[PDB]
């Protein structure tokens, strides 16, 4: 019963901001989290950001303050606000739902669900 | 890539999917497993075919091995009858030969061989291990009768542990089971992260929980929480086959004690040790690749004569291997099916081609026949008929753990005797009582998040939040349901007060303007004193009138004064009492006539003290009245217009207005409920105007001295009492007091007392002075 | 079960899934199809390899055939390299040989071979026919720019026609496309049932529609509706490859004319007839089972020499077969890929095992490489790169049909030049204009169910009903939106009337108690006549006072009468005018003082006509006034208490009440907005009481004859004018008329005129008789 | 993308009434209906009643007087009320989705979607 959708794929410059929204279908994100990962086309998939089941986040040095992720159980949706991104922020944004660990979400290959893999090009 | 032809054309060979690679299997199981189970199966086979009279003496024995894996797994699955049917290769001088492989181990690991067997028509699922779906069904079956709503979940990296958690995910919703957390534990987990998840565990306050962790996976979990010593905790250790094995340390059960968990008792294999002792270095005519892996795992530079005992005794860790016992039972069932078809009735199957079940087998279609619809009764277990969903399922031993102070360990209780399969039923078979763990506490009285609130309340729900958590809010006013936790809040009868439920009532005391309470006593005392003084003035009047001065003055004046006081006081008496419509018909005209004729007596006394004059002519009336008839008919015309307008509003429609009280919520007081009474107000105003008339004749009385100055007292008493009555009538008409105690009654009685004190007292004194009047 | 090895190790063989049975294929296609396409493919191959310098001269040619079907479909899919890798059967003297089959026809019919090729790693989808999903995307792409909400659906029993209807079902909702009907048509349909569905079609009034029926399926559909002759109908004939073929009869286009439909132009195969003429009875060294089906379809009792022309010419119905052209293009692409790998660069692929692309091929992995990322440019079509979703997609010819009166037929227009694939873009490429069908009517102006209603309105929605159908209902009062069809109905400025939108206004005419309208003229005339008569009485007074009778009578009496009339009339003049707070401060004390001193003059005239008397003592005041100072100070004390109470309510808080009008909705009238003015009512009542005083002195004037009987007139005028003023003051205080025209002004002016007529007229007549006064 | 679940499966008498309520999940009923059929277990599936997406209904010879079928677009679910039932009420109610004809829905095999087939054995 894992279904997800992506919205907000546009094009902005380095200084531009981007809004990204993920909506679930019947899946309550209170039971388990949902991971968001960045994979430029032609290369492997790396987890730039990741949220634990609780209201805690695990970032990387490339998303310090530039990426903000918001989650709430009532609306079963995820929000990503990006501000002042580095120019090669272009890539494919992938959503996953699947039981994992604290660091096993950074590598992001243990998720059973596979998303549509919407491609976003900003340059 | 192994190929093990054996006793009989039925050859239980092919690559084993449980092994995923040569290196995997070499440094995972064979480096210290090692494929000895099939040797025991072949023992049993050769020992039982000697017992049998030539069960299957057709083909010979031979072992040849050459060790994703899909290509060689299917290639070893390739028999010879498939590649020689027509297959007219001019260089292939093939001959007829039929092997057939059935056994599959580790089917969950690799399903390509299952698909191949599905397409070929040789599908043979015996994973012979019972699946975890039945265990999830069992954990649900223990969910219902606990009568508790939500439960927590803990999982690990185990592949078999996932399908349980997803299945719980899709079954929880239809029977309101809420999930607060479901997180994974790996082989090694971070310290501060585990502290964080356990902290959010105390935050969630979801005390009942089920854990899917394996032994070594759950060992750190029981380890961390020892430091902080929070020990009111209960678990649900599923698949606890190794019960109290890795948790056996003391003071651990002070935290992890009283845990109930599933288990499966496994029958010990007879002579397992001597089964495993036969393998020796380089005396083995068969299974040459047993020899190769023995060579490569003990590199062969040296160690060419060591025995299993000389090696570091690898038969202590696995005293009874689950997969070994499962494949043992599977091969026993297959051998029993072969014996059966050797001794079956003369009859045919249901499949069109390849319908040759004889001493010679064609594609092994009778084996699935005897699996699907035949009993086994093998290995003192009394197995059920082999089924697709469940191959061989026994009674699940739901074991309970008890601390043993005399032993310092955990004792197990088979009190859980149940299974989910239909061999015993779909209903309960569990014993719940006569067990304790530091008291009787597994009921968990506060496992429900919300309590049973007081009656007449809705278990208000947070939007987008599971129905388990509800907070109770008070029903609207005047509405109350009898039993607690009633979603359909219903109307309550109007016979009780708020009664700690905020209800409404309509049946209360009714004010009848007279009661045993002191206001009634006071008004009755006023009434009786008025009646007594009227009796006394009647007595003094009858004393006055006995004298022959009668008909020298106007006896009718005092006679009608007495009638006026009587009727006005009768109206005052009618004023109190239980109010209804009939009382109003008997009251309102009485009030009007009393007012008009009492005031008419006042006016006829004020205008002319002595007799009136008129012409002396013979008519229908008598002559002695000397003109009093005109005064009588003036009062009479007032009386008529009053009672005829009364009957005009009588016959047209009864004077009933809407039933109103001081407050419709708690006060239920019956009133006159007549109406505005426009004509009543008009006649009251006309009476007031009539009182305003004859002021100037009272002044023509102030000039001349009359009968030793008595009319001046009448004049000022007129003034003061008329003005006080007209000033206190609208206060009664406006103030709420009319509901609690009528003010018109006291106003009119005071006015009547003043009116009698105007003249009666003065002329009583006068006749006490001069009796001649 | 067919097996066709051919020129080169690449062998494009295996059972064709398009055939579902031996009998099916025998009495469906071969009884009159018949597998000639592969012969043409092998022709093209042989002369193309003669053109090429030894393209693939490795293996030979050979055809052997033996004709669910899954078992033999996969068995023919079995090559020889799969069953000889290790395969050490002691009787199988196998040798190395590698065939590889790619072509799949009718993949939609049977997917088991696709699954087999998926598991083996030899997946090859070229259904080479373009799928109907692209056609559904195209029909959607023509949905948006028509700018119309809903559309009807008609389907048939065709298997390919379903996925379109389901896809429309899940795509309609997110972009508000409503469906009214979607029903199936079989090969034969009942008469009254079809009449019933068409009747509910007129009931639905869903005029725009799309039909998925095939030619013979839609032929009855165009047939039935001819009888009733309803001919305003437009269709959307999807997959109309055979356009105007089965509908070509005259008078049919009077009903079915002007239909727009998709089509695909197919290039004619060069020499198709001579391609099909080569097959002859019993001169065929290859394809022996071509011979068997020729024998069995022409049973062989006789007919051993007949040719295709002698048979009933089975090459008229299918002039150009779609599957034939599709497989022709597929085999051309495969041959071009083989030529490419023969002439590719020296480099390696992406796979790990089987990475041997040489003159000798291993498992045909380069063919999918050149399909996935290489152009074709074959058969003068300039094909796009082969893709999984779309293999080879050309420009969709959206053909439009026009009636031709000069020809009595239908002419086609390629005006639709578009495709859904990304080769040209995702946006519009369609020509819409310069076409007509009995006029310009395909816009369908009333295709929207609901119209654009007037501004300020809710397109109210039926609950549980699609948003397409909305009915317009009027916004609440005082609220109005500017543009039509505004869901967010917003507040409107308060400057216009209902203006066919039911709005509200607050800016209207304001009553200032004086205007050019005739009421203002009348009140001004009354004011000016009053002023003129005051001037005249001032003149006659100055005439009277010039005589030396002054100081023999009281000149102060008439002087203060003139001051009283002046100030009372000034208050009357101040009564009208624009009302504000400052006007009220200047007005209310003026009203009070005018009332009290005019009435004080009246009282001082009534009580004593002649001079007052008092003791003669020397004090601060002068002596000649002879006691008038007490009357002055009595009037003065009244005046003080008035103006001091005025200032008491002045300095404490300005007397401003809430701004109220006759009606808050449409009437905006500025009023005094002062308050209840309790002390003003008290002083008015005191003034009325003062008028009630001195009645008895007026009576002491009625007895004695004074100055030839003038005070009786004063007395009765006192009575009548005081009572009329006191009777008309509450009518003004209660009646609404005070807003439209003040009644207090006319009441006070009439009262003042009467008061002057009391004495001034009488004594003017007297002095006209006797000047000595 | 169509899902359904059965409810109201109980045992009544011959004259008793049975209530069946089934709510669709994730699929509006406006596009097409959801047919219901009655199969005696152990034999071929039979269609007692037939729904039409145009809100029409189609009944067999004996259905009149005992079956009532309710379906609406707003609520996209189906009610089946039974009264004065035949004595042998043992059977399984099977739900199907897919475009078909009137006779095709009466035979009831043209539907592509297959339900779980919850069964209640009244046996009265």
Tab-separated table of C-alpha atoms in Angstrom, chain C residues 271-419:
chain	number	residue	atom	x	y	z
C	271	UNK	CA	6.497	-6.308	-55.563
C	272	UNK	CA	4.135	-7.807	-52.985
C	273	UNK	CA	2.244	-9.715	-55.688
C	274	UNK	CA	5.388	-11.278	-57.159
C	275	UNK	CA	6.501	-11.920	-53.575
C	276	UNK	CA	3.364	-14.020	-53.055
C	277	UNK	CA	3.387	-15.679	-56.499
C	278	UNK	CA	6.463	-17.859	-55.918
C	279	UNK	CA	4.664	-20.459	-53.785
C	280	UNK	CA	3.551	-23.349	-55.995
C	281	UNK	CA	2.191	-26.853	-55.312
C	282	UNK	CA	4.951	-29.381	-54.671
C	283	UNK	CA	7.898	-27.430	-56.071
C	284	UNK	CA	9.289	-26.247	-52.734
C	285	UNK	CA	12.533	-27.726	-51.412
C	286	UNK	CA	12.207	-25.778	-48.144
C	287	UNK	CA	9.362	-25.165	-45.679
C	288	UNK	CA	7.819	-28.619	-45.836
C	289	UNK	CA	5.018	-27.709	-43.475
C	290	UNK	CA	4.001	-24.961	-45.831
C	291	UNK	CA	3.371	-28.015	-47.993
C	292	UNK	CA	1.440	-29.808	-45.252
C	293	UNK	CA	-0.951	-26.927	-44.662
C	294	UNK	CA	-1.385	-26.510	-48.414
C	295	UNK	CA	-2.301	-30.209	-48.537
C	296	UNK	CA	-4.733	-30.101	-45.610
C	297	UNK	CA	-6.486	-26.839	-46.545
C	298	UNK	CA	-7.190	-28.075	-50.104
C	299	UNK	CA	-8.114	-31.718	-49.494
C	300	UNK	CA	-5.149	-34.343	-50.830
C	301	UNK	CA	-7.813	-36.162	-52.856
C	302	UNK	CA	-7.499	-33.727	-55.778
C	303	UNK	CA	-6.351	-30.183	-56.648
C	304	UNK	CA	-2.651	-30.952	-56.973
C	305	UNK	CA	-1.789	-28.427	-59.703
C	306	UNK	CA	-3.847	-25.311	-58.917
C	307	UNK	CA	-2.107	-21.958	-58.496
C	308	UNK	CA	-2.995	-18.954	-56.339
C	309	UNK	CA	-4.856	-17.372	-59.263
C	310	UNK	CA	-6.818	-20.604	-59.750
C	311	UNK	CA	-7.779	-20.485	-56.067
C	312	UNK	CA	-10.357	-17.818	-55.314
C	313	UNK	CA	-7.764	-14.989	-55.304
C	314	UNK	CA	-7.233	-14.551	-51.536
C	315	UNK	CA	-5.132	-11.417	-52.128
C	316	UNK	CA	-7.903	-8.833	-52.570
C	317	UNK	CA	-9.161	-8.533	-48.980
C	318	UNK	CA	-5.695	-7.780	-47.552
C	319	UNK	CA	-3.982	-5.432	-49.994
C	320	UNK	CA	-1.602	-4.304	-47.225
C	321	UNK	CA	-1.522	-6.304	-43.988
C	322	UNK	CA	-0.492	-4.368	-40.883
C	323	UNK	CA	1.290	-7.265	-39.163
C	324	UNK	CA	3.120	-8.097	-42.400
C	325	UNK	CA	4.491	-4.560	-42.719
C	326	UNK	CA	5.359	-4.429	-39.011
C	327	UNK	CA	7.343	-7.680	-39.065
C	328	UNK	CA	8.920	-6.524	-42.345
C	329	UNK	CA	10.182	-3.367	-40.634
C	330	UNK	CA	11.302	-5.380	-37.595
C	331	UNK	CA	13.366	-7.851	-39.628
C	332	UNK	CA	14.797	-4.957	-41.649
C	333	UNK	CA	15.907	-3.278	-38.413
C	334	UNK	CA	17.443	-6.533	-37.162
C	335	UNK	CA	19.332	-7.017	-40.441
C	336	UNK	CA	20.586	-3.424	-40.321
C	337	UNK	CA	21.778	-3.963	-36.742
C	338	UNK	CA	23.608	-7.106	-37.881
C	339	UNK	CA	25.257	-5.121	-40.682
C	340	UNK	CA	26.215	-2.440	-38.153
C	341	UNK	CA	27.858	-4.883	-35.738
C	342	UNK	CA	29.625	-6.334	-38.770
C	343	UNK	CA	30.909	-2.788	-39.434
C	344	UNK	CA	31.045	-1.346	-35.899
C	345	UNK	CA	34.048	0.289	-34.274
C	346	UNK	CA	36.571	-1.817	-32.321
C	347	UNK	CA	35.171	-1.490	-28.823
C	348	UNK	CA	33.312	-3.443	-26.155
C	349	UNK	CA	29.836	-3.483	-24.635
C	350	UNK	CA	28.262	-2.904	-21.191
C	351	UNK	CA	27.702	-6.579	-20.083
C	352	UNK	CA	30.287	-8.633	-18.160
C	353	UNK	CA	29.769	-12.225	-19.302
C	354	UNK	CA	29.232	-12.994	-22.971
C	355	UNK	CA	31.091	-9.869	-24.131
C	356	UNK	CA	32.176	-11.295	-27.493
C	357	UNK	CA	30.894	-9.243	-30.429
C	358	UNK	CA	32.964	-10.539	-33.347
C	359	UNK	CA	32.230	-12.203	-36.670
C	360	UNK	CA	30.923	-14.935	-34.332
C	361	UNK	CA	28.051	-14.028	-32.013
C	362	UNK	CA	27.524	-15.421	-28.515
C	363	UNK	CA	24.057	-14.500	-27.185
C	364	UNK	CA	22.979	-11.580	-29.435
C	365	UNK	CA	23.447	-8.773	-26.921
C	366	UNK	CA	24.701	-6.221	-29.458
C	367	UNK	CA	21.368	-6.310	-31.311
C	368	UNK	CA	19.549	-4.801	-28.326
C	369	UNK	CA	22.436	-2.333	-28.021
C	370	UNK	CA	21.873	-1.072	-31.562
C	371	UNK	CA	18.109	-1.093	-31.023
C	372	UNK	CA	18.301	1.014	-27.859
C	373	UNK	CA	20.721	3.785	-28.920
C	374	UNK	CA	20.953	3.858	-32.717
C	375	UNK	CA	18.907	5.163	-35.632
C	376	UNK	CA	17.508	2.939	-38.389
C	377	UNK	CA	16.550	5.007	-41.487
C	378	UNK	CA	14.917	2.031	-43.198
C	379	UNK	CA	12.141	1.661	-45.784
C	380	UNK	CA	12.024	5.398	-46.640
C	381	UNK	CA	10.412	6.157	-43.283
C	382	UNK	CA	13.274	7.614	-41.216
C	383	UNK	CA	12.384	5.615	-38.124
C	384	UNK	CA	13.150	6.842	-34.609
C	385	UNK	CA	15.400	4.989	-32.175
C	386	UNK	CA	13.798	1.781	-30.910
C	387	UNK	CA	12.366	2.313	-27.423
C	388	UNK	CA	10.657	0.031	-24.920
C	389	UNK	CA	7.430	2.038	-24.645
C	390	UNK	CA	7.334	2.782	-28.375
C	391	UNK	CA	9.242	0.632	-30.855
C	392	UNK	CA	8.773	2.523	-34.171
C	393	UNK	CA	6.256	5.427	-34.118
C	394	UNK	CA	5.575	7.633	-37.124
C	395	UNK	CA	3.534	10.783	-37.626
C	396	UNK	CA	-0.118	10.086	-36.835
C	397	UNK	CA	-2.282	11.223	-39.757
C	398	UNK	CA	-5.319	12.713	-38.033
C	399	UNK	CA	-7.537	12.540	-41.118
C	400	UNK	CA	-10.651	14.672	-41.566
C	401	UNK	CA	-13.547	13.569	-43.784
C	402	UNK	CA	-15.346	15.844	-46.259
C	403	UNK	CA	-18.421	15.033	-48.310
C	404	UNK	CA	-17.772	15.430	-52.046
C	405	UNK	CA	-20.959	16.352	-53.951
C	406	UNK	CA	-19.097	16.106	-57.269
C	407	UNK	CA	-17.958	12.566	-56.373
C	408	UNK	CA	-20.591	11.335	-53.909
C	409	UNK	CA	-17.907	10.071	-51.529
C	410	UNK	CA	-15.542	11.161	-48.746
C	411	UNK	CA	-12.232	12.961	-49.283
C	412	UNK	CA	-9.523	12.745	-46.617
C	413	UNK	CA	-7.480	15.677	-45.236
C	414	UNK	CA	-4.035	15.108	-43.632
C	415	UNK	CA	-4.663	18.368	-41.676
C	416	UNK	CA	-3.855	16.403	-38.487
C	417	UNK	CA	-0.054	16.207	-38.330
C	418	UNK	CA	0.852	15.208	-34.782
C	419	UNK	CA	2.297	12.513	-32.528
